[PDB]
Amino acid sequence: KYPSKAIPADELIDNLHSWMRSVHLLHVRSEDNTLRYNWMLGVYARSTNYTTPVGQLVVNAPAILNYSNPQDAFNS
Amino acid sequence: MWHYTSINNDTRVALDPKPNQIRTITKPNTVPQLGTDYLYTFNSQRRSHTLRLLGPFQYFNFSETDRGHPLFRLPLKYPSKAIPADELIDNLHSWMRSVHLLHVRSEDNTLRYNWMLGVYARSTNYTTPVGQLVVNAPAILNYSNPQDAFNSVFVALGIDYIDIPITNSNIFDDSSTPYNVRIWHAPTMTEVNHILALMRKSTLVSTHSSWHWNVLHTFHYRSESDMIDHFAAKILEDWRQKEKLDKGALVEADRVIQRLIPLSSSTYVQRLAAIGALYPNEFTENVLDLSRLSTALLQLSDTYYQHANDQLRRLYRRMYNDSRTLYMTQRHQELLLAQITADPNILLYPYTYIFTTIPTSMNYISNTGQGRIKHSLTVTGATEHDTVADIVLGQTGEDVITISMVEPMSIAVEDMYGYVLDTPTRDIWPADEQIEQKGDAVALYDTKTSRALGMFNNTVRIDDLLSPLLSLVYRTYIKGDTMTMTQGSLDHLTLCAAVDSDITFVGNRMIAPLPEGYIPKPMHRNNSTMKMLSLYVALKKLENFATNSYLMAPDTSIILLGAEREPAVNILRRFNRNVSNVRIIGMGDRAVEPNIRVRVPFPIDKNISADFIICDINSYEDQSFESMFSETISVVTTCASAATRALVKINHPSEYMINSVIERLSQLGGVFYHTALLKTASQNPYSYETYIYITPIAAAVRFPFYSNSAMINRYMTAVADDEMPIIPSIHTVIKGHSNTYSPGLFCGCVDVQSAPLALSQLKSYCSEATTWRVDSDDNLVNIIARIDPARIALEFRTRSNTSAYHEYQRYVPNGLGFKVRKTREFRYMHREVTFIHKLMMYALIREQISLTENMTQVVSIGGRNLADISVVPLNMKYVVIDPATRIETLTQEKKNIEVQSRPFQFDAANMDLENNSIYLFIAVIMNEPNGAATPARMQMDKIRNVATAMLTRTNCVAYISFYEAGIITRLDQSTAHKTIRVEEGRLKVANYVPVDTLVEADVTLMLRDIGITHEIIRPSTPELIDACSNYGIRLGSTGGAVLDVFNHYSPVIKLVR
Amino acid sequence: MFNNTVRIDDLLSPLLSLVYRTYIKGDTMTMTQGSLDHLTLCAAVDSDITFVGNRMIAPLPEGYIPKPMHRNNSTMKMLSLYVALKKLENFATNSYLMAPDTSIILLGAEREPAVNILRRFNRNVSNVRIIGMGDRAVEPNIRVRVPFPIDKNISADFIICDINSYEDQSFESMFSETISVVTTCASAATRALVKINHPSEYMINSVIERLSQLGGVFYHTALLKTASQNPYSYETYIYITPIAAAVRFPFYSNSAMINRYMTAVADDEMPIIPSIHTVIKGHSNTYSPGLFCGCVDVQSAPLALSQLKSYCSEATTWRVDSDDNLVNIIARIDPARIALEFRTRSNTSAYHEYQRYVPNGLGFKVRKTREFRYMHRE
Amino acid sequence: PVEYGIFVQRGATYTINAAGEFEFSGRNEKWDQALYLSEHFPALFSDVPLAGANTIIAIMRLFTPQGFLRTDDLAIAANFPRASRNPQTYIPYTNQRGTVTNEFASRFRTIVATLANVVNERAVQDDMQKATRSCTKQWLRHLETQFDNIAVAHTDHLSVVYATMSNFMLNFTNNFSGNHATFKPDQYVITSPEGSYKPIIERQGETVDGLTIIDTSIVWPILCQCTYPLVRQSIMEEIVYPDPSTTLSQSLSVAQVLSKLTLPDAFINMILSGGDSVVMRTYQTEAD
Amino acid sequence: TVTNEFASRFRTIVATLANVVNERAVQDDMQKATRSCTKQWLRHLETQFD
Ligand SMILES: Nc1nc2c(ncn2[C@@H]2O[C@H](COP(=O)(O)OP(=O)(O)OP(=O)(O)O)[C@@H](O)[C@H]2O)c(=O)[nH]1
Ligand SMILES: Nc1nc2c(ncn2[C@@H]2O[C@H](COP(=O)(O)OP(=O)(O)OP(=O)(O)O)[C@@H](O)[C@H]2O)c(=O)[nH]1
Ligand SMILES: Nc1ncnc2c1ncn2[C@@H]1O[C@H](COP(=O)(O)OP(=O)(O)OP(=O)(O)O)[C@@H](O)[C@H]1O
Ligand SMILES: C[S@@+](CC[C@H](N)C(=O)[O-])C[C@H]1O[C@@H](n2cnc3c(N)ncnc32)[C@H](O)[C@@H]1O
Ligand SMILES: C[S@@+](CC[C@H](N)C(=O)[O-])C[C@H]1O[C@@H](n2cnc3c(N)ncnc32)[C@H](O)[C@@H]1O
Ligand SMILES: C[S@@+](CC[C@H](N)C(=O)[O-])C[C@H]1O[C@@H](n2cnc3c(N)ncnc32)[C@H](O)[C@@H]1O
Ligand SMILES: [Mg+2]
């Protein structure tokens, strides 16, 4: 839309915001303080719109993204 | 103040107009006015428009015809932004012109107008039987006695009730209403009782403790959820009202018990009814979160359903099992009595139990709203602990807590250009001293300086330390926000150092506005840039001290002898753009243009001279000491020969190098070179690199050689460490009273229930600990706590593990922080220089004390708030004799610390020094107990008395700190002392009163006259590194400049017997 | 009832908002740096202010409308206590900015908005500590109990205590706690301004005796009361300072601030709630304090003014419009008029004059009027 | 598309919480009618405003009912069976006696204005000819007129029919609350302790000779190709007021059959009602 | 998935071609009718593609 000049900050912000409103990662919030969220696998699943086996696993069991020991997050 | 004071009134009846005001109630003639006729607001975050009419129109049903009006088309017309006020007003006005309620104006003054029925009729466009009755007999709306206003429509229509839809307050939303208000024909109390009884035989209905127009009305809900949200909002209203009534304030409550009574509801609404009637303490403490009110309310019931208190549990249960009854306090009940007295035929809900409220002593702390709590943990408390479980802290995301390496240094701009001096002291340089110092400098050069000092010097760079400030001047100048400053001013030089573009004043004290569309790039600076600027400022302050303008004089020159890109040459050239005829050139062996590229010493053909020079020569190549020495010598020689005011760098400032430089200047024919060591505040705080200042003077310089100079001690005392540098850990497991923790900081999160326990345990290590929840919804509380060596040195003196756990549990859940924004902690927090010098002196005295054998106790006179506690070993007993110290007999008994709490008497005969004792007098002799300055003769006198008093003792060791006189000579000539001062010849450190200084020569002479053993020691570089590594402190720039000259002139006398 | 009804916060609210409303429109312009008007401005808006030059505040950046400063009931009071200390260090001062390289502590703390306002008021002064320090304190304020922990080092050139335990407690514990609070407040600063929640002669004198007991310092003291306090509060601020001289006449007896509290005692009767009367009886003398308020047909209006002369000294009246015959009437009941009129049974009045008012001679006002149950008096 | 992405990121469905708050799925799934008895509701009908998706919400407002909730009073007086504690029926439109303007029709007017703005924006975005665009608007205002012309017949005549059919004996369930956002039918089952339960309402796939499929297209003949006795003004049909007996008797008959129909099962299960039993061991705690 | 990513990509592709053929259409001053007809065929291809 703007081949030769800077995107005006208003349009950049408004589109970036509406697109941010557009995103929602799957998750199961929990009270354990040791838990983390496997950002990579979640954003990936979302990007494939949950069609890959990982996206299936995530769409059915979002809790699998939560993890204590970092490695186990993938072993799971 | 037990009895409630209140004036209950049917506010809703008062809202209804006289029939005569109905014609003009729309105010057809004039535009609606904001804040009086209407209340528009646009929440941009929610993108939700909200209009709300005031006056009678706050209660107003809309006909679909009214909803077809463009006014209601407006929010769709402006999805993302506020409706402009003109359109709002014009549409609101034309719609106001659109409305006309039916009425029959009459001359009776007792008459009112039934606003509800009229607006309702109009909204249904008079199709309902009420609308028919009104369209045919408008006069029926007029009424004297409020109740009859409805009885008249009940008799005339023959119906037992009328179902009026409720209004949404925000006229914009067209959403289906949660419930609606049925209105019953029940003039008598008996008819009311019967309707209530029958109402308890039917789904989803509730009612108020009393009713408006004295006419019975029931809410009928379209679902359970609607009933729950309604009951919740009402519980909040009743609780706020009762919260006000219990304060004894007069209230204009429209009704005594604001909360709803279920007649038939589900379990959950019965739970809300029960905790609602309880008036739990937890509401007043703000322990509940109102962001999702009903939820918390349900949870509250869950506690009360199984409450630890028996009375509250049985009370809540009993209320739950008789939801239809209206529980109320005796104090409410007397208000209900006053109401029934003033209006004998008032109706109010007949089924009502009167309970005495159950007191509860637990005052929870709480505060919804942003702001992390910065706890100061107590060493001890009423709570005892035994084998506390290890408390794991969670991993924290960077979304919540970031851990930057070093805290950036907030500071005033002028403070960047300060420098400190160190004048020479020795009148002669004996050859044996030359061999000793040469052996020292060679041994020190051949084996590299301390690895820890290297780590700090390479971690705490001055460039990053200044970066947030220099950029900020650029950001303001880019916005045009900057305006006025003097031509020669330091603020001006900072501006030239912040932007690449040439600046120009439009007149006195006024920089030119930026040309349109112009946004010049920030000036590019390497690490030595600001330093070179500050050295230039130093020379400007040395040519004459009083100057405020820093511009070079016309027809004069400067050379920056070490060069590369040398941005400082460009900045300086641009700073002096308005001065006529001034050479400004760099001249390195690696120099790029503008700077000439050339080796030093200069080629014999080339002619180089200037009124000033700032050498920064430094060979990157590793080399023999003899070559480094000859090279630095030749560099100082050519630097001095070429200018009247050289400012040579000295990369390895041993006493031998500097003295060889003085001897070499002595060797030059016919000129006598005055000289002084120097250190600017723009140097890296930890660098031992020092700038010698060479100038010629006609007089021979008495005392030209250096011995035990401060700047020299900064380098020479540093030596290779036995140990690896102490890398700052982040701890995540809070063990109970363990004492295994390496310096660093606890950082993580816990479930908020476990938070009081965590603060209870980390009091053993950290002196203080910031904490916060991220949001009201997320139960984890984040916690950051730097480890204090002093707290360890206090807490671990005994095995007892007391804490204020009982207090910290008053924080859960709202009482320990809220912050959505990500926080940024540093591994090396800023501290003022005096504090660093304190910690250094403590490292010196503590290392000194651990060496001594068989001493029963440490007596720290004037110890204040156990400031010297870090020094004393955990085994031996500690004693304080500062009058100002607070007494804590429990803390003293539990932690093995006597406190005399009396002014120590310095007279020798009165004094009683125990054998096998270490007497600390750290900065106590220089002040009277009341804080007034003690004159120096009195200080030398009291030191003499402490000396004579310990002559009888077999084993005793005094440590009398004091201020040497020489510092006043040096600070009078320096600039970098934001903290330290010199008010009329006296030192004025920190906020302390000015105080006269002792001379070291007379003190040592006096101690020789007493014959007691003595050794004037001062903390060195390794003590600094230990202080910073242990406390997690970065030095900071002003501190780096002033610390050498300050530390050297706080001698610690070490009396020994 | 009066102390909890006549809050100072609502009493000041129309004024503090007005300074915000003017500043938001850019209508405000000139004021001195240390001036009280400046401090009021810092108390009115959350955004940091900055002068563009002497006696001139900077214009608002375009599109910027900063939120009003959030204030609790004790905010303006804390500001006024700070002003009091500034006036006590030297009476003649006009600038109220803290001196460079000096510190203050607001010892009682929570959100303590006053600490933020004060910190922003002194933004142009170099190097000044300003911190709250409550047991309930939220950041910036450090959270800590008083007396201070024996390890922690606390000192300042000024302190403004506002400590007040919400918990009901034994008198001996309240006494020991207030004593320790004054003691730590005096030890920590050269100019303490401690609150005294229950200023009996005994409490204050015990405080003077306790300061007498501290070694080597003689504490001059004075009771104090700022105008930003709730008008009815008996809470008083003792002012502790040290002076080289021993203070002749240091104890209090029959002091005014003390009498405000000590003379108050539990009443035999319930508080007199202000009624709104609606029936004007003829020369009756039964009316509880409050005010007549309502309307009559304008023909009956001269009669009404004729009767309420017995009670009210004066009575505002008006018709709403030329078309509506009812005349509204408001009349506060004067005890003095009752004490005059009821000395004898005669019921004379200027009815003959009041009937010269009907119909146009007794008011017109379309705008809604706002009467108060508690009118201001000097 | 943008508003869509913002809407559907929230979730295609939601569940009302026990605390009463909505909880959207966060998932984009096709609805199945098996979900109708489930905890879930379609999210288009939540009436919960959402930032950046205001157009979808405002369009979804147009589906709001224009009726009222009449209590089934005659059915109570007659003591007819009613599954609810307070029986009620949502009658789709109010009687509009004596009014020059018809509110049911005016609502359709505002609805059509909204659709005009919507179809206008879509028309200009797709650069379609002015001719077709105005033709769409013309058809819309025509629908407006047709709607008024029959609105009289629905609101003032069909409504009394709904109002009496609500009181008929066998019409025992509550039909609708008037709140699409929150309504779900009360779900009774015939549970037994020693068996599996039968829901009364079930998606059992019996179609009752096609009665369960709904042709919404049926609205077109209603608006456009049907006469009503009130619509016809000026000829005068004179309204029919059907004899109660013909349905009443039918109801009775049904009620009389299904009454005794279960009797023998009821009698035996009464006898054997105490007859189920658990195996139990009795340990002896003392001698003899 | 309710939406098909392979098809949605073709959707964005077609929007781009719409902008392109739009610019070429207005540069050559061609009739509004044919222009909207091109857009119509494009959205038809979109549907077939899904
Ligand atoms: N899609 C996706 N890729 C990731 C994510 N996190 C890491 N990666 C990728 O995984 C690769 C391996 O991770 P790293 O060990 O951090 O490799 P890296 O090249 O050092 O990553 P950089 O920080 O960009 O230098 C990187 O190339 C990243 O692009 C994630 O959350 N989502
Ligand atoms: N349509 C209509 N509803 C009214 C009118 N006046 C009161 N109501 C409704 O009648 C209900 C009962 O009246 P109240 O006793 O004042 O109940 P309330 O919930 O305390 O009302 P609030 O002042 O909004 O808190 C309220 O929910 C109002 O919404 C009116 O004039 N017109
Ligand atoms: N807060 C409460 N107040 C009164 N009774 C309760 C409460 N909570 C549970 N009960 C009793 O227990 C039964 C509900 O059981 P349970 O608590 O396991 O599930 P619930 O209804 O979801 O409540 P909770 O949310 O406390 O689990 C109800 O019949 C009720 O009588
Ligand atoms: C520490 S750097 C500082 C230079 C300058 N302040 C800058 O960074 O722009 C010193 C430089 O002086 C040069 N140098 C070292 N020895 C020199 C010598 N004997 N004569 C001239 N230049 C020398 C080195 O190449 C080195 O780059
Ligand atoms: C500078 S402070 C503490 C310095 C250092 N941090 C320490 O703890 O030793 C010195 C304190 O000693 C106390 N003091 C001064 N003169 C004293 C005296 N003559 N006898 C006892 N205490 C004294 C004062 O109250 C003052 O607070
Ligand atoms: C009346 S409030 C006023 C505080 C402050 N002016 C404000 O509102 O922001 C006094 C506070 O001091 C706290 N407090 C009470 N006793 C204390 C004590 N002994 N030590 C420290 N703080 C105390 C209480 O928690 C109370 O919230
Ligand atoms: Mg109300």
UniProtKB/TrEMBL annotation, chain B:
<feature type="binding site">
    <location>
        <position position="864"/>
    </location>
    <ligand>
        <name>S-adenosyl-L-methionine 3</name>
    </ligand>
</feature>
<feature type="binding site">
    <location>
        <position position="620"/>
    </location>
    <ligand>
        <name>S-adenosyl-L-methionine 1</name>
    </ligand>
</feature>
<feature type="binding site">
    <location>
        <position position="631"/>
    </location>
    <ligand>
        <name>S-adenosyl-L-methionine 1</name>
    </ligand>
</feature>
<feature type="binding site">
    <location>
        <position position="528"/>
    </location>
    <ligand>
        <name>S-adenosyl-L-homocysteine 1</name>
    </ligand>
</feature>
<feature type="binding site">
    <location>
        <position position="566"/>
    </location>
    <ligand>
        <name>S-adenosyl-L-homocysteine 1</name>
    </ligand>
</feature>
<feature type="binding site">
    <location>
        <position position="564"/>
    </location>
    <ligand>
        <name>S-adenosyl-L-methionine 2</name>
    </ligand>
</feature>
<dbReference type="Pfam" id="PF20832">
    <property type="entry name" value="Reov_VP3_MTase2"/>
</dbReference>
<feature type="binding site">
    <location>
        <position position="600"/>
    </location>
    <ligand>
        <name>S-adenosyl-L-homocysteine 1</name>
    </ligand>
</feature>
<dbReference type="Pfam" id="PF20790">
    <property type="entry name" value="Reov_VP3_GTase"/>
</dbReference>
<dbReference type="InterPro" id="IPR048608">
    <property type="entry name" value="Reov_VP3_GTase"/>
</dbReference>
<keyword id="KW-0949">S-adenosyl-L-methionine</keyword>
<feature type="domain" description="Reovirus VP3 protein guanylyltransferase">
    <location>
        <begin position="9"/>
        <end position="279"/>
    </location>
</feature>
<dbReference type="InterPro" id="IPR048607">
    <property type="entry name" value="Reov_VP3_MTase1"/>
</dbReference>
<dbReference type="InterPro" id="IPR048605">
    <property type="entry name" value="Reov_VP3_bridge"/>
</dbReference>
<feature type="domain" description="Reovirus VP3 protein bridge">
    <location>
        <begin position="727"/>
        <end position="821"/>
    </location>
</feature>
<protein>
    <submittedName>
        <fullName>Structural protein VP3</fullName>
    </submittedName>
</protein>
<dbReference type="InterPro" id="IPR048606">
    <property type="entry name" value="Reov_VP3_MTase2"/>
</dbReference>
<feature type="binding site">
    <location>
        <position position="882"/>
    </location>
    <ligand>
        <name>S-adenosyl-L-methionine 3</name>
    </ligand>
</feature>
<feature type="binding site">
    <location>
        <position position="562"/>
    </location>
    <ligand>
        <name>S-adenosyl-L-methionine 2</name>
    </ligand>
</feature>
<feature type="binding site">
    <location>
        <position position="528"/>
    </location>
    <ligand>
        <name>S-adenosyl-L-methionine 1</name>
    </ligand>
</feature>
<feature type="binding site">
    <location>
        <position position="590"/>
    </location>
    <ligand>
        <name>S-adenosyl-L-methionine 1</name>
    </ligand>
</feature>
<feature type="binding site">
    <location>
        <position position="562"/>
    </location>
    <ligand>
        <name>S-adenosyl-L-methionine 1</name>
    </ligand>
</feature>
<feature type="disulfide bond">
    <location>
        <begin position="615"/>
        <end position="639"/>
    </location>
</feature>
<feature type="binding site">
    <location>
        <position position="563"/>
    </location>
    <ligand>
        <name>S-adenosyl-L-homocysteine 1</name>
    </ligand>
</feature>
<feature type="binding site">
    <location>
        <position position="600"/>
    </location>
    <ligand>
        <name>S-adenosyl-L-methionine 1</name>
    </ligand>
</feature>
<feature type="binding site">
    <location>
        <position position="838"/>
    </location>
    <ligand>
        <name>S-adenosyl-L-methionine 3</name>
    </ligand>
</feature>
<dbReference type="Pfam" id="PF20830">
    <property type="entry name" value="Reovirus_bridge"/>
</dbReference>
<feature type="binding site">
    <location>
        <position position="302"/>
    </location>
    <ligand>
        <name>ATP</name>
    </ligand>
</feature>
<feature type="binding site">
    <location>
        <position position="599"/>
    </location>
    <ligand>
        <name>S-adenosyl-L-methionine 2</name>
    </ligand>
</feature>
<keyword id="KW-0547">Nucleotide-binding</keyword>
<feature type="binding site">
    <location>
        <position position="904"/>
    </location>
    <ligand>
        <name>S-adenosyl-L-methionine 3</name>
    </ligand>
</feature>
<feature type="domain" description="Reovirus VP3 protein Methyltransferase">
    <location>
        <begin position="855"/>
        <end position="1055"/>
    </location>
</feature>
<keyword id="KW-0067">ATP-binding</keyword>
<feature type="binding site">
    <location>
        <position position="904"/>
    </location>
    <ligand>
        <name>S-adenosyl-L-homocysteine 2</name>
    </ligand>
</feature>
<feature type="domain" description="Reovirus VP3 protein Methyltransferase">
    <location>
        <begin position="473"/>
        <end position="694"/>
    </location>
</feature>
<feature type="binding site">
    <location>
        <position position="842"/>
    </location>
    <ligand>
        <name>S-adenosyl-L-methionine 3</name>
    </ligand>
</feature>
<feature type="binding site">
    <location>
        <position position="600"/>
    </location>
    <ligand>
        <name>S-adenosyl-L-methionine 2</name>
    </ligand>
</feature>
<feature type="binding site">
    <location>
        <position position="589"/>
    </location>
    <ligand>
        <name>S-adenosyl-L-homocysteine 1</name>
    </ligand>
</feature>
<feature type="binding site">
    <location>
        <position position="631"/>
    </location>
    <ligand>
        <name>S-adenosyl-L-methionine 2</name>
    </ligand>
</feature>
<dbReference type="Pfam" id="PF20831">
    <property type="entry name" value="Reov_VP3_MTase1"/>
</dbReference>
<feature type="binding site">
    <location>
        <position position="619"/>
    </location>
    <ligand>
        <name>S-adenosyl-L-homocysteine 1</name>
    </ligand>
</feature>
<feature type="binding site">
    <location>
        <position position="305"/>
    </location>
    <ligand>
        <name>ATP</name>
    </ligand>
</feature>
